[PDB]
Amino acid sequence: LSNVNSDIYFKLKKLEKEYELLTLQEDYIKDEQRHLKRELKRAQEEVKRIQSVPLVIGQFLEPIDQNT
Amino acid sequence: ETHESGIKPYFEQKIQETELKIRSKTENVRRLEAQRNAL
Amino acid sequence: NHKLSESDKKSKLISLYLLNLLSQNNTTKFHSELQYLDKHIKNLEDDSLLSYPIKLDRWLMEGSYQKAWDLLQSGSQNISEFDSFTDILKSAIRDEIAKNTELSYDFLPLSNIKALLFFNNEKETEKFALERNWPIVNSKVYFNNQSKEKADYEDEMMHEEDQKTNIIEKAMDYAISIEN
Amino acid sequence: LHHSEKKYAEEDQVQELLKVLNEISKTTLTLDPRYIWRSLKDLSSLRNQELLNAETLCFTVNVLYPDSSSFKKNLLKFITSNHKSSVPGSAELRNSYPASFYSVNTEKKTIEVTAEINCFMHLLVQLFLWDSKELEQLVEFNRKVVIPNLLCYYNLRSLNLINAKLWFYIYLSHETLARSSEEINSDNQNIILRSTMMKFLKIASLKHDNETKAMLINLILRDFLNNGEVDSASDFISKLEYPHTDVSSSLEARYFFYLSKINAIQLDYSTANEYIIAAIRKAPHNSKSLGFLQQSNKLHCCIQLLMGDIPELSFFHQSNMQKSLLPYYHLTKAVKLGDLKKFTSTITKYKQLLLKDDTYQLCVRLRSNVIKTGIRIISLTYKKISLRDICLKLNLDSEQTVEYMVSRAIRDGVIEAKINHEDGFIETTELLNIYDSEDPQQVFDERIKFANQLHDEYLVSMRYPEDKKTQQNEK
Amino acid sequence: ILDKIFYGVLDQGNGWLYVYETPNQDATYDSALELVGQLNKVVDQLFEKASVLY
Amino acid sequence: ELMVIYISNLVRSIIAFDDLIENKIQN
Amino acid sequence: TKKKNEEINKKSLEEDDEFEDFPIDTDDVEVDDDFTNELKAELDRYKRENQ
Amino acid sequence: RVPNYEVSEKAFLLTQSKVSIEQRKEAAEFVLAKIKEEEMAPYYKYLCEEYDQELYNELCKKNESKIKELNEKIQKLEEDDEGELEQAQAWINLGEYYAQIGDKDNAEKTLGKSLSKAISTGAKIDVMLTIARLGFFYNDQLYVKEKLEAVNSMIEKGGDWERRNRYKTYYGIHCLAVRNFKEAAKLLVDSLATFTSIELTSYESIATYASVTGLFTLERTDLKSKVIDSPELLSLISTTAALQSISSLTISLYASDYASYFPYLLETYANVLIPCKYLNRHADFFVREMRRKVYAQLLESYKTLSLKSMASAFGVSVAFLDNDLGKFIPNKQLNCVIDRVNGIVETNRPDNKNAQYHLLVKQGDGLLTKLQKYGAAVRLT
């Protein structure tokens, strides 16, 4: 078990900064998903403005399509 | 061999600590990744 | 397994120990000590002198203080250095009842205090009342005083905000519970 | 005849051993090997019954043997030496393959395989001893061998998961022989049994291996109940190093069972009632948990009676555990009425049955509870009641004696009343509607946190299988 | 009184009749009892779906 | 949602095993 | 079978099977009071006539 | 078949030593007349414990007679060519012989042959029930339970409306016999209309029992509609003594005259609950409930009463009242406490916001238990 001990000093010390970066990436994406929450709502506003006056009354005939 | 069995708890503490950190990091970043993509 | 490992002094010394824990007024610790002995006294040493502190605990547990008090007195006719813990455990009886009787009413006729707590003279009665912050005006006690005063002092401490839990406090916790 | 059966039996074992061996030496997936090791033992225990059980002996001859050969010999010597093919090297079914142990190269020390084979060999040995009841000599010798063998090795996490089963066996065999009949030599070894599992608690805590930690903690707490030092248990239990991270639900159930017993006698039912119920749910519900199921029901009856609660009559009636819960049933009635006379007769008559499970210790203390519980119910019924009426009903000596047992009781707010001696009745202290009061806010606060906890639990966990599935190759 | 045509209570100790009309009871909570009732069926069904995991 | 995503995983195990199975058949 | 080792270890510590030691070894709370009651209500009336 | 319920109820009076000595022996003469008439030698051995060898010779004889009759018949029929129809009708007559002698076991066997060859689905249901009846005759309720289960499988497979009416009454008796008086109250009030006389405890008995189950279960309001104003009960009038005793009781409750209620309670206990076998075991359940339900109704109408006043009305002593009420308070329907010294019985009942708080908090706690159990399980698996 003499072999493992050597590696702590050499290899793994260098990789400890690499493992800091994984904590930073984790932190980052909470902020990014949070952002898309806000955005969702703000997009909602836009849609609402269309719904509003002025409007013109029609007669729906038939569908061609679930969304058209 | 016999010497190194005894002296091990100095070394063993630091490396096993570090490894645990990798296991929990990977877990977290990929869970949040899925959430971000859906939204 | 036996090679002495027993003594004539053993039954005696164990009894005094137990007695000591009761004078501290610790029910739990008395049980803890008992369990250590329990197995090795069941019939190997039987129960005949060891019996004095077990009978006393039992009665106080029940809350029959009358009963406890009688046996204490009769312990001095079966004295085996019992006297040294007798005296302590008599002051204990009075403290315990006094604490109880706060919740029951505010006023006791002078005669009732003396009877209940087992005072033998009215001197002991008026002494104890002073130490409990109760004046005796016209031969009547007056628990009314100390109860209110104790609440007032308690309110001054620092632990405390979370122990009562403010309305502002309750909401804030739930909001960040959600926003984690 | 005999040889063929042992050989086939040995072969069956050889198959299982190889699966779990490959598994450990191919990447790190620790949790999967550990579950496999649990099944392997049971399979082998059911196996032994048939195709003879000197298959172990066969395998010993045909492995690398450092001191396992002489240990095996020791084993047959206890139960009278029976030799019939028991000389090492009189089977070679390895055949020096790189697929099933390279006999030369291991001896040479270019490759090493005696490690794991040794740890497994002691495990097989212990299983056989306990099944048979080959106790005596073998127990001391076993304890002696395994401790320098496992500490010889630079301990893994892997290795720790195997030895937490060995530690149990050491403890069990010593105890069982002891209750059969006392010996002096048995108490000398007791001191040594306490010291070894206790020292090891620190080792296991540095390694942060969860299986080992859990196990050691249970054993040490049991030990303290055996010898009656409640005090020692207090210092030990303030620190909670009990992991609950990944351990078997069965260990969790065992832990909670200790906690109940100790707290109860330290006069707390708040925690006790929670842990024995919690343990039932944690514990499996197979036909292998009949022992456990039964005794949980027995301790809980006591805990409730001690607090002053009356357990369901329905609980004992509708049970299939009624046969056993015959003393408990009788206690419940006696207490209910406040009749003193019935209580004395009950406790004396059932002394032996209660004493087995040490519930007798709890039952002396239920003398206070007989009188007090009958008065909880009488205050409930009659709001204002003269001390005179109480005395006649429950046989209690005089109005002055009843006042003293009641005065103590209401401090603790069991009965919830206040005495008026200057008038002469005792008047229940009502709370009536508690919605009107501010009680519900506190109820809510807790519950919200419980909901919150499950959500986080769902979320961490949900991801776990998904991470595996993505990385594997798919069509 | 039992028919509930004016539902009061009679105190004999004073020889008085107090009559009560429309006692207040949480309406918010009336709507919640039906909502919790639905949730309880739903968790049994969900587990049954999840019996496939076993 | 636990259940629904979980059911998908169980199926994912099956499709993964097939990949290995399908490779054998061409060989 | 994975549970099986833990369960076997645990049963020993509980004490074999006390459930099966027990048969080898050896207003539902108390009795209906209406029979008695009959006797009582009638006697009330007897007194009551003469009161 | 038909004699079995009559035989057993007479046998049950004789068993009892509670009832008047006169009734016990009046019943002796009557059971004896049917014992001889039907040849009950296997079954006499059960009855003689629980309170001529000629009955047995007569038996055995009846055995070779009725036993042989069916045998050789059954054989000529199995030889003759129509297998499905003719053999099975004959096996129905086979089951009748065992059913006459009160042996429930051999009756089951031959009636099983009857079913075996294919018969009308409706006919199979008639047959299952016949076996079921013999379960009441022994008083083995466990026997009835399983038999009646097999009928409900076939009741809607067939569509039979005809056999559904019978099942209602038998199931009424089942529920009545068992401790659950809830299902009984429902099943039996609708068996009044759809009473089928054929092999069942008389119409007069059913009517009495319906009232009993009525009283235990149903609210004051719900008794009025369904039992008192129940058109059938009024059509049947009070003729039998038992019907009268239970009916009168109902009435004085509603009308709230509590001078006449307690004398009727005493009557129903003597003449109705104790002699009926089913209600001998449930005597305790029913009488404790009635005492609590009447006292609850009176407390609701009073903020406060005197003990002397409540007692005086009933026609029980102040002492008597004080004990009997303190049994009933901790089971909690009365919802009152008694000031001994002032002698007042004050009544405290919540009707406010607290009602809607308790219901909510309890239901919502029951839901959380389930979430924990199920969630934690699925994570592991």
Side-chain angles (χ1 to χ4, degrees):
Chain A
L1 300 174
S2 208
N3 193 53
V4 285
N5 295 325
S6 306
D7 306 346
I8 292 168
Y9 293 101
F10 190 26
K11 194 61 178 171
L12 202 44
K13 274 185 174 45
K14 305 199 206 178
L15 304 174
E16 276 172 73
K17 297 286 183 72
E18 202 182 55
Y19 302 154
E20 188 60 71
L21 296 163
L22 280 172
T23 308
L24 317 181
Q25 275 170 253
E26 176 190 344
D27 305 305
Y28 181 52
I29 54 187
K30 307 174 194 163
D31 209 289
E32 283 187 290
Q33 60 183 279
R34 185 164 44 258
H35 202 177
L36 290 154
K37 299 200 182 195
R38 292 175 284 206
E39 285 175 86
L40 196 64
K41 307 185 177 295
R42 201 188 303 294
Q44 299 325 94
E45 192 183 3
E46 315 187 297
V47 181
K48 294 194 292 186
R49 308 160 176 166
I50 297 300
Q51 292 171 332
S52 311
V53 314
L55 298 157
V56 60
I57 311 187
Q59 178 62 235
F60 183 88
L61 307 165
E62 66 176 44
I64 62 170
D65 194 65
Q66 198 79 252
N67 299 335
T68 313
Chain B
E1 287 163 61
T2 67
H3 189 190
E4 307 300 311
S5 287
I7 65 171
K8 191 179 56 161
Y10 180 59
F11 306 99
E12 194 63 63
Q13 182 162 69
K14 298 174 194 304
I15 177 166
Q16 86 173 254
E17 188 186 59
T18 308
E19 279 174 282
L20 202 48
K21 191 171 190 299
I22 320 166
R23 304 314 178 204
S24 56
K25 253 67 254 206
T26 37
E27 187 44 70
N28 307 322
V29 67
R30 298 189 286 181
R31 192 171 72 237
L32 301 156
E33 177 169 15
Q35 305 177 12
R36 193 202 71 83
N37 298 335
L39 280 157
Chain C
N1 296 337
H2 184 286
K3 51 154 62 178
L4 305 171
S5 95
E6 63 180 351
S7 291
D8 291 345
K9 290 185 177 66
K10 187 184 168 171
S11 179
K12 186 169 202 178
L13 290 173
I14 293 172
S15 292
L16 301 172
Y17 199 172
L18 283 165
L19 289 170
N20 280 319
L21 299 169
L22 292 173
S23 73
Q24 297 183 118
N25 303 327
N26 202 315
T27 308
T28 70
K29 189 169 182 179
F30 185 82
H31 305 348
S32 295
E33 183 64 19
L34 286 172
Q35 178 62 56
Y36 186 64
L37 306 162
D38 179 19
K39 297 191 163 180
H40 298 284
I41 62 175
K42 293 187 161 292
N43 51 359
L44 302 168
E45 293 277 45
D46 306 79
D47 201 20
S48 196
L49 182 59
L50 285 177
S51 63
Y52 181 78
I54 292 169
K55 290 176 182 178
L56 278 167
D57 182 50
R58 183 169 61 252
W59 307 138
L60 279 170
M61 181 188 55
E62 289 175 10
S64 187
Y65 298 123
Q66 162 183 305
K67 286 290 177 98
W69 185 267
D70 295 328
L71 212 86
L72 277 159
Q73 287 183 109
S74 296
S76 301
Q77 308 301 300
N78 190 247
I79 190 167
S80 278
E81 302 177 357
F82 289 172
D83 64 283
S84 319
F85 320 102
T86 300
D87 282 293
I88 312 185
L89 191 54
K90 286 169 164 174
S91 283
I93 281 166
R94 310 188 149 126
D95 187 61
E96 290 199 288
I97 296 160
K99 196 181 188 185
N100 301 337
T101 55
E102 296 315 283
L103 286 167
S104 294
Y105 32 52
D106 287 55
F107 307 127
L108 289 94
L110 184 60
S111 189
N112 287 350
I113 292 271
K114 181 176 174 185
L116 290 167
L117 285 154
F118 294 122
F119 294 119
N120 301 107
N121 240 137
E122 44 159 278
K123 317 300 181 170
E124 309 193 69
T125 311
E126 56 188 324
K127 179 68 194 297
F128 185 75
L130 303 174
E131 308 190 88
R132 297 300 276 184
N133 325 104
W134 302 321
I136 305 180
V137 185
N138 296 323
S139 305
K140 179 164 294 286
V141 290
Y142 278 117
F143 301 173
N144 70 283
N145 287 274
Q146 195 194 16
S147 290
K148 190 195 182 185
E149 197 50 75
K150 286 184 290 160
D152 302 324
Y153 290 153
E154 188 172 52
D155 300 352
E156 195 73 84
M157 59 202 189
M158 293 185 285
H159 298 302
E160 182 198 13
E161 306 296 304
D162 55 73
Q163 311 184 312
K164 302 307 201 325
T165 330
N166 220 284
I167 299 184
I168 304 166
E169 187 164 21
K170 281 159 186 173
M172 189 48 81
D173 301 342
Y174 306 127
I176 65 178
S177 297
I178 291 180
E179 292 294 305
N180 279 324
Chain D
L1 305 175
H2 72 101
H3 183 62
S4 304
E5 289 172 356
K6 288 180 295 180
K7 186 174 180 294
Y8 307 151
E10 188 195 347
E11 281 170 0
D12 297 352
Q13 300 287 114
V14 159
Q15 294 167 59
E16 298 167 0
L17 183 146
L18 267 162
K19 292 177 182 179
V20 297
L21 179 62
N22 280 123
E23 206 172 355
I24 198 65
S25 61
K26 177 175 165 184
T27 188
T28 313
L29 61 184
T30 298
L31 181 56
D32 305 337
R34 277 189 269 171
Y35 290 143
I36 302 299
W37 293 338
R38 289 183 276 205
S39 177
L40 192 143
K41 288 171 62 181
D42 297 300
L43 286 162
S44 309
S45 198
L46 293 172
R47 184 69 292 178
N48 290 163
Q49 172 189 263
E50 303 197 74
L51 295 182
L52 299 173
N53 58 27
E55 34 73 60
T56 183
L57 181 55
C58 303
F59 191 61
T60 300
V61 168
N62 198 54
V63 291
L64 300 300
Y65 26 95
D67 63 357
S68 67
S69 41
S70 66
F71 184 33
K72 183 55 69 190
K73 299 196 179 73
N74 205 255
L75 180 62
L76 275 297
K77 175 75 79 72
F78 192 52
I79 59 165
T80 293
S81 309
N82 302 301
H83 290 172
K84 71 286 193 175
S85 174
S86 32
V87 170
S90 47
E92 171 72 17
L93 301 173
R94 299 170 285 170
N95 298 316
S96 305
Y97 294 162
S100 52
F101 303 121
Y102 208 119
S103 298
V104 172
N105 282 229
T106 317
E107 292 297 323
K108 288 176 69 175
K109 203 188 143 179
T110 174
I111 57 165
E112 310 217 78
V113 297
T114 305
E116 195 59 6
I117 281 187
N118 196 69
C119 305
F120 295 158
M121 194 59 77
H122 297 315
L123 180 58
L124 289 167
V125 166
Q126 285 174 342
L127 280 163
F128 180 71
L129 291 180
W130 179 252
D131 301 332
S132 188
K133 296 180 182 178
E134 287 153 350
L135 296 175
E136 317 195 280
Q137 178 177 311
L138 275 286
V139 176
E140 186 289 282
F141 209 58
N142 185 242
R143 192 178 73 185
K144 188 180 180 182
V145 177
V146 172
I147 311 161
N149 281 350
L150 306 161
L151 295 166
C152 182
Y153 58 64
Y154 299 121
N155 303 79
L156 307 174
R157 300 189 169 271
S158 298
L159 302 171
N160 279 4
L161 311 153
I162 307 173
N163 67 25
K165 307 198 180 68
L166 283 63
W167 291 340
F168 186 73
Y169 289 119
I170 292 167
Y171 193 91
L172 194 61
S173 54
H174 180 78
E175 206 187 10
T176 313
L177 189 66
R179 295 174 273 161
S180 283
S181 171
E182 292 182 341
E183 188 63 60
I184 65 172
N185 288 333
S186 301
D187 295 304
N188 295 335
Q189 277 175 308
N190 208 109
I191 305 175
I192 289 173
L193 177 59
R194 189 172 303 164
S195 288
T196 61
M197 298 304 106
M198 191 190 280
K199 186 189 180 185
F200 300 160
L201 192 51
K202 100 197 174 177
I203 293 197
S205 300
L206 178 72
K207 288 299 310 181
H208 301 277
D209 184 293
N210 312 109
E211 185 71 61
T212 46
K213 269 218 292 296
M215 185 58 53
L216 294 170
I217 290 162
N218 302 332
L219 292 170
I220 293 169
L221 284 169
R222 182 178 177 83
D223 202 70
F224 292 151
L225 292 166
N226 289 339
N227 74 337
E229 289 184 299
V230 203
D231 296 318
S232 305
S234 317
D235 306 309
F236 182 80
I237 70 195
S238 54
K239 314 201 189 287
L240 188 149
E241 294 173 2
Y242 182 73
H244 52 283
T245 55
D246 200 2
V247 311
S248 189
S249 58
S250 305
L251 307 187
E252 296 185 295
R254 285 158 60 171
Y255 181 63
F256 288 168
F257 185 32
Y258 300 106
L259 297 171
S260 291
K261 290 182 180 182
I262 294 168
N263 289 358
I265 65 171
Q266 293 174 323
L267 301 190
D268 199 292
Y269 307 121
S270 199
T271 51
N273 275 332
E274 183 58 54
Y275 291 129
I276 197 56
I277 300 298
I280 301 166
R281 299 174 162 150
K282 294 282 186 186
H285 300 291
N286 288 320
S287 186
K288 293 167 290 166
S289 77
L290 309 169
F292 188 81
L293 280 171
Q294 179 52 75
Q295 197 62 260
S296 294
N297 284 341
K298 290 167 91 295
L299 194 65
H300 186 43
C301 295
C302 299
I303 289 162
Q304 288 166 289
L305 295 171
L306 290 152
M307 184 52 194
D309 309 302
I310 299 174
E312 299 177 34
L313 297 169
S314 297
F315 174 71
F316 305 91
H317 295 163
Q318 300 295 319
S319 64
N320 61 341
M321 306 300 196
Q322 170 64 280
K323 294 179 169 192
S324 44
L325 283 167
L326 192 63
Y328 292 84
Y329 187 71
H330 290 306
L331 288 170
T332 307
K333 291 181 293 184
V335 171
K336 201 273 170 194
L337 300 164
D339 180 324
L340 198 60
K341 179 179 177 181
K342 182 178 177 64
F343 174 75
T344 318
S345 312
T346 300
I347 63 172
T348 57
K349 174 181 174 181
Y350 300 138
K351 179 165 186 195
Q352 185 274 330
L353 302 159
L354 301 154
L355 197 73
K356 294 190 63 183
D357 310 291
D358 304 7
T359 49
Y360 193 62
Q361 316 193 324
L362 305 178
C363 304
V364 172
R365 291 165 170 79
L366 289 183
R367 188 164 295 274
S368 48
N369 289 119
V370 166
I371 292 168
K372 285 174 169 188
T373 305
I375 293 169
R376 174 78 278 278
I377 303 309
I378 293 169
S379 45
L380 180 61
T381 56
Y382 294 99
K383 164 176 187 179
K384 191 169 290 84
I385 170 156
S386 310
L387 272 158
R388 288 119 279 191
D389 301 305
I390 312 188
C391 289
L392 298 155
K393 289 176 184 301
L394 299 192
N395 302 322
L396 300 176
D397 298 291
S398 296
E399 46 189 66
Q400 195 49 90
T401 308
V402 170
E403 185 282 333
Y404 285 136
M405 298 180 286
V406 174
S407 57
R408 189 175 200 267
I410 65 171
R411 168 196 65 187
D412 290 303
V414 159
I415 299 301
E416 294 292 358
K418 64 182 180 180
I419 297 168
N420 309 298
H421 198 64
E422 308 76 31
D423 290 331
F425 53 82
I426 300 171
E427 184 173 67
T428 308
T429 301
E430 324 205 297
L431 296 166
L432 293 150
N433 178 8
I434 64 170
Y435 184 73
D436 284 344
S437 80
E438 303 190 67
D439 290 331
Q441 290 182 18
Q442 298 75 329
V443 172
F444 295 152
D445 286 329
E446 177 63 22
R447 287 176 175 144
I448 291 167
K449 292 177 182 180
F450 176 77
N452 285 339
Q453 287 166 343
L454 292 171
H455 291 180
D456 291 346
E457 288 175 353
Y458 292 160
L459 291 172
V460 172
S461 305
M462 185 177 69
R463 194 71 198 152
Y464 280 31
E466 296 173 28
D467 285 344
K468 310 191 201 152
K469 305 293 92 174
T470 55
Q471 299 185 98
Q472 287 173 318
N473 289 332
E474 279 179 35
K475 188 173 79 171
Chain E
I1 291 168
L2 284 164
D3 295 340
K4 306 303 173 180
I5 79 190
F6 71 89
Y7 54 99
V9 305
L10 170 48
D11 191 303
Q12 292 183 329
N14 301 317
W16 296 334
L17 177 65
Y18 319 76
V19 169
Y20 311 113
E21 289 296 317
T22 321
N24 292 118
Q25 309 175 36
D26 289 312
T28 45
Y29 298 1
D30 289 355
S31 302
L33 291 168
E34 178 57 39
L35 189 55
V36 190
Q38 292 170 315
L39 291 172
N40 288 297
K41 177 169 60 156
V42 151
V43 176
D44 301 304
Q45 291 168 314
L46 287 173
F47 199 58
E48 290 170 348
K49 288 184 70 173
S51 65
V52 305
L53 308 157
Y54 305 79
Chain F
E1 184 48 39
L2 291 179
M3 299 159 178
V4 181
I5 195 55
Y6 283 164
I7 293 169
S8 308
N9 291 332
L10 180 84
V11 181
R12 276 191 276 167
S13 307
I14 298 174
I15 293 169
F17 305 144
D18 292 333
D19 182 274
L20 307 152
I21 304 164
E22 195 41 68
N23 290 347
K24 292 169 185 177
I25 297 164
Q26 312 301 105
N27 185 43
Chain G
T1 60
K2 317 189 173 185
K3 293 176 179 304
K4 187 167 159 292
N5 292 314
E6 287 79 60
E7 292 175 91
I8 285 161
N9 290 340
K10 174 169 67 167
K11 197 178 189 191
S12 296
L13 295 164
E14 298 295 1
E15 199 188 17
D16 230 79
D17 212 352
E18 69 278 21
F19 185 49
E20 309 307 325
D21 289 347
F22 275 107
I24 293 169
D25 286 346
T26 48
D27 284 356
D28 64 350
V29 71
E30 289 302 309
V31 177
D32 184 65
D33 297 303
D34 293 76
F35 172 75
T36 64
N37 284 333
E38 180 179 358
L39 295 161
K40 315 170 187 179
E42 290 294 295
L43 173 66
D44 182 74
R45 186 183 63 254
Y46 309 158
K47 293 188 295 180
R48 186 177 295 278
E49 292 162 353
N50 312 149
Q51 292 169 333
Chain H
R1 185 166 305 259
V2 182
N4 289 332
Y5 47 87
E6 190 176 2
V7 166
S8 57
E9 290 301 293
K10 296 158 177 187
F12 186 70
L13 294 165
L14 285 155
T15 303
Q16 302 187 310
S17 293
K18 310 200 185 205
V19 300
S20 47
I21 292 169
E22 318 185 68
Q23 182 60 62
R24 297 175 66 176
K25 295 284 177 284
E26 192 71 11
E29 298 159 0
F30 298 179
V31 85
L32 272 171
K34 295 314 190 171
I35 293 169
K36 278 194 207 81
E37 282 165 1
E38 304 304 274
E39 191 282 296
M40 297 323 297
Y43 197 72
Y44 178 51
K45 279 299 182 186
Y46 297 115
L47 298 166
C48 69
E49 177 62 40
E50 262 85 65
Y51 165 5
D52 37 32
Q53 272 297 279
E54 311 171 357
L55 180 57
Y56 309 53
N57 294 290
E58 186 183 1
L59 190 73
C60 303
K61 172 173 183 168
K62 300 194 204 154
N63 258 19
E64 201 275 324
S65 185
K66 317 178 234 119
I67 304 160
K68 190 173 169 298
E69 286 179 303
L70 44 89
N71 281 347
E72 296 151 331
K73 173 159 137 288
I74 258 76
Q75 176 180 20
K76 185 177 175 177
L77 293 182
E78 291 183 285
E79 263 57 276
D80 282 295
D81 285 303
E82 173 69 55
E84 308 306 82
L85 179 59
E86 297 297 297
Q87 309 176 8
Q89 283 180 79
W91 282 315
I92 310 165
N93 308 124
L94 228 159
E96 180 55 65
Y97 181 72
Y98 307 139
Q100 278 162 11
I101 51 179
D103 203 329
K104 52 177 190 192
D105 302 317
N106 291 323
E108 279 188 314
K109 310 307 190 179
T110 199
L111 282 165
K113 298 184 209 171
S114 193
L115 314 156
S116 272
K117 299 292 180 179
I119 65 183
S120 288
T121 297
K124 297 179 179 157
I125 301 162
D126 314 315
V127 170
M128 176 51 82
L129 286 163
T130 294
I131 314 310
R133 193 70 196 153
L134 300 157
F136 302 110
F137 192 34
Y138 283 52
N139 199 21
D140 191 5
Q141 204 72 50
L142 305 173
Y143 190 103
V144 186
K145 182 175 180 284
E146 296 156 25
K147 299 288 176 314
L148 275 193
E149 284 162 5
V151 172
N152 186 64
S153 303
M154 305 152 73
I155 193 64
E156 88 297 283
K157 163 172 182 174
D160 295 287
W161 286 90
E162 299 288 14
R163 289 70 186 178
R164 207 164 313 267
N165 304 302
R166 303 167 61 183
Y167 187 67
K168 287 189 284 290
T169 320
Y170 280 110
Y171 200 38
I173 302 183
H174 178 73
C175 289
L176 182 61
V178 300
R179 291 304 189 180
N180 168 293
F181 264 55
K182 177 167 175 175
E183 307 299 303
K186 302 191 164 184
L187 281 150
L188 290 162
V189 287
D190 299 332
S191 76
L192 303 163
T194 61
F195 165 67
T196 44
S197 47
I198 297 170
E199 197 189 1
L200 271 153
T201 197
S202 46
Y203 194 48
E204 287 299 302
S205 65
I206 289 169
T208 294
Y209 307 167
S211 307
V212 176
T213 47
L215 293 187
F216 192 95
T217 66
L218 294 172
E219 303 295 342
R220 180 167 164 268
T221 319
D222 287 342
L223 276 174
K224 191 64 167 48
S225 176
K226 306 176 184 174
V227 175
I228 307 193
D229 295 333
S230 200
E232 175 282 298
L233 180 64
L234 299 173
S235 289
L236 195 56
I237 62 171
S238 289
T239 309
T240 197
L243 190 34
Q244 176 66 67
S245 191
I246 199 47
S247 65
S248 59
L249 180 48
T250 312
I251 294 159
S252 58
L253 195 57
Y254 211 76
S256 303
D257 192 355
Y258 290 140
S260 44
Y261 184 84
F262 290 78
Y264 301 145
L265 285 172
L266 300 156
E267 297 168 24
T268 49
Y269 300 1
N271 305 299
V272 191
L273 296 169
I274 294 175
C276 172
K277 184 176 77 274
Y278 294 129
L279 302 177
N280 189 68
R281 85 181 292 210
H282 298 301
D284 64 319
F285 192 45
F286 178 82
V287 294
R288 296 272 85 187
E289 190 65 6
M290 288 308 108
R291 289 287 305 286
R292 287 190 289 266
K293 291 184 82 75
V294 63
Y295 294 161
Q297 297 175 20
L298 186 71
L299 289 158
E300 194 165 2
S301 303
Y302 295 94
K303 179 65 179 176
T304 59
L305 290 152
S306 189
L307 292 162
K308 178 63 163 180
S309 74
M310 289 151 62
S312 287
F314 301 150
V316 302
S317 308
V318 183
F320 307 154
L321 185 66
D322 161 65
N323 176 57
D324 299 333
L325 287 175
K327 307 184 188 295
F328 295 146
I329 287 175
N331 296 323
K332 293 287 169 59
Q333 291 185 358
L334 291 197
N335 300 351
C336 62
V337 281
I338 303 92
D339 190 339
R340 302 173 77 84
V341 179
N342 289 323
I344 297 294
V345 174
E346 57 169 278
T347 70
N348 301 281
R349 172 162 278 125
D351 67 19
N352 74 112
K353 301 177 177 186
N354 184 233
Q356 298 306 329
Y357 179 60
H358 288 171
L359 299 153
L360 203 45
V361 294
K362 297 171 177 193
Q363 186 187 21
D365 287 341
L367 172 56
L368 282 168
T369 318
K370 199 184 292 169
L371 284 163
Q372 180 61 72
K373 290 180 328 173
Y374 295 179
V378 293
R379 296 190 290 281
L380 295 165
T381 305

